Amino acid sequence: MLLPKRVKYRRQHRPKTTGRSKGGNYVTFGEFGLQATTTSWITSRQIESARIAMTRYMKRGGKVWIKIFPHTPYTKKPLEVRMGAGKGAVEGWIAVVKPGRILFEVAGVSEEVAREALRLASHKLPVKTKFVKREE
Amino acid sequence: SSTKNGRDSESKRLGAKRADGQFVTGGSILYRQRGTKIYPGENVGRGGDDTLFAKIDGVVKFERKGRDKKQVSVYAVA
Amino acid sequence: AKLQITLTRSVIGRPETQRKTVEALGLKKTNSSVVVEDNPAIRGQINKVKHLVTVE
Amino acid sequence: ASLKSIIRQGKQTRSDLKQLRKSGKVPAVVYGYGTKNVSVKVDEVEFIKVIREVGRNGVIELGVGSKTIKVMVADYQFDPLKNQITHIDFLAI
Amino acid sequence: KIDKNKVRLKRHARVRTNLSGTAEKPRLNVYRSNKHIYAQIIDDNKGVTLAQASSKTATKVELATKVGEAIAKKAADKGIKEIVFDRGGYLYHGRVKALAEAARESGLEF
RNA sequence: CUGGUGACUAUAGCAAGGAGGUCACACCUGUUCCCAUGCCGAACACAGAAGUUAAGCUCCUUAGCGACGAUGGUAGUCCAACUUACGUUCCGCUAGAGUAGAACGUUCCAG
RNA sequence: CUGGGGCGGUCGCCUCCUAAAAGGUAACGGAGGCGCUCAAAGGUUCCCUCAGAAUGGUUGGAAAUCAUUCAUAGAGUGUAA
RNA sequence: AUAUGUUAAGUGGAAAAGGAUGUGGCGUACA
RNA sequence: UUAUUGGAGGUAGAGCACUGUUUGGACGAGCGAAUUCAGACAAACUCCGAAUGCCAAUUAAUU
Secondary structure (H helix, E strand, O other): OOOOOOOOOOOOOOOOOOOOOOOOOOOOOOOEEEEEOOOEEEEHHHHHHHHHHHHHHHOOOOEEEEOOOOOEEEEEOOOOOOOOOOOOEEEEEEEEEOOOOEEEEEEOOOOOHHHHHOHHHHOOOOOOEEEEEOOO | OOOOOOOOOOOOOOEEOOOOOOEEOOOOEEEEOOOOOOEEOOOEEEOOOOOEEEOOOEEEEEEEOOOOOEEEEEEOOO | OOEEEEEOOOOOOOOHHHHHHHHHHOOOOOOOEEEEOOOOOHHHHHHHOOOOEEEO | OOOOOEEOOOOOOHHHHHHHHHHOEEEEEEOOOOOOOEEEEEEHHHHHHHHHHHOOOOOOOEEEOOEEEOOEEEEEEEEOOOOEEEEEEEEOO | OOOHHHHHHHHHHHHOOOOOOOOOOOEEEOOEOOOOEEEEEEEOOOOEEEEEEEOOOOOOHHHHHHHHHHHHHHHHHOOOOOOEEOOOOOOOOOHHHHHHHHHHOOOOOO
16 A cells, blocks of 8 residues: 655646656666556556565565555545536545556566566556566 | 635736847836846846836846856946 | 749638748739749748748 | 778768668767767677677777777667667777 | 954955945055055056055054055045045954045045 | 955865975964953954964865766757658757866066 | 525635746636734944754753854744745 | 559458467577 | 847756655664665756747848
């Protein structure tokens, strides 16, 4: 349940989401990584589901890193209400991902057990992915 | 089911009023500001509310005054 | 007396800023031409509306 | 066998650089000591393997305009999505 | 463990922000030391120095007056009366006013 | 290769080590004489035989931290064609890198 | 006034964001404040310089007071920004 | 109409995550 | 309207030097966010910073 301990403002604007990724396009902690090829929003619940599956397959084999964090919240309106009369209330926290960013990095295992722990975790995410190694 | 916001004050027309290289009179306002974001130069005065005005007739000149600071001056035309 | 510019496309549906550059050159209607000498300011007008006229 | 090279003359347009990368050739700049700033052209594959032997800091010995100059790789640009090198900087000590 | 004159220059800078010397009203600068006293007339608007005078007893106070009429007579030869006095960042008392007093009384209009 | 006083974006700074003087700057031994401290003749100003380069201050060396940084690429972008994300033509970042750089210097006093 | 009308909320002035590097610009869009105070908290002249203080102390649940160095202003500026 | 190539689905003439030695192009002893 | 020479103004992008938020290690002042080595985020963060547009010069040519 990743969520910032405190924020200055609880009602923000939504990110642009159009363009290419800004930073974090390389592997710097582990031996392998999972790279994204499309744009989408990632919620804390999705990150939780996608990392528990990876941990189970590896059987506590090595280290796993999460390079994304849901910094931005989003509001939602009640059910069956009319337009206007103020803004909604916080519902959850999301993160913006664009083509060329790494989501998960693992280390301490082989190249085969690592290519199967990331495939079982890429089906929990709403974005397309790819297998990438530390570039030589 | 209500809003707590919805207040705002009238907008003040701040900024420069004359351009560089332009001819002005003795009492022409050159820059309205809050505080001193641009300092007065030769033949220039700072008003009560930080307004910059000329004192003679001449061309306007926006120049730099030190590292990360600006001024405005007025030189008589010859 | 060095260049010849003729208007091929019309001005309907174009921004008002471009319709004013077609007036400084001396073009009234479609397919109208005019003769002027190659100046530094003359080519600055054609370049702005090079998608509408045909310089020769 | 020292690798081959080409000299980019003038200034290329956005399209010229894109078509050059499409062919399989990557642009490069050499600004090391003892040389001037000249734009060169080297095959992407020809560089990918010659760098294998010399490694990261080995001596390239690139030849510009019939004059071989001993040089090394200082920094380069890489595209992670399409996995295509974009730019290479050669530094001659 | 401090420098006496290093800090004095900062006080002089604050004084010379609203006090300047033009051709008609040249600034009169006064530099002081442990033994000798100095003086100088400057025209900053262009950057020329017009006059110069210096001592080189009684706390060097009588010597300070020795420069008062000394420089005033120099200026009197060129017939310039209007001037603007510059303390230099030194408190206006003792020897500093002697140099000014010795020059003011010699038909020099401040 | 000095002192005084100005002009300019630290390329003028910060460090680290070295050399030098009683002609000048300072340190320096005094509180009767004008004036001064909310403990300190500490500072301010004073009355001024000696005592000394240990620091203040200087001209000399070194690129360590700061500062100045093109060329070539990249992102973005005005205009125009396709179509919604892709072509073409002008402009042109940030960051990083080869790099400059241990100031330049008017008037002026006496040497 | 009002995403029909009621009910609820709101009505003048000040600062910021939305506002697309001149100025201007909407919504029942996102955040606060005002209906004063000061006879010195005003004018003028001369002086001065702050938080935090890797340690020492008449040793009081490390921060009242005093002492020496790090100190690019991280202090203050009657009252919102 | 001319020149050189691709697609066999009526694709062309409506849509996704995913699933397939369907078929082209350019690069790195097997029964 | 255009070419040229000038100026004012912090958006896109970028960045972590300020205010925040925040991942993985190293060092014992009680050691994951007022020490250090890496990697990220922001309409109300900015050491930096365009393309355009805007204000001017009884400057030049076409209207």
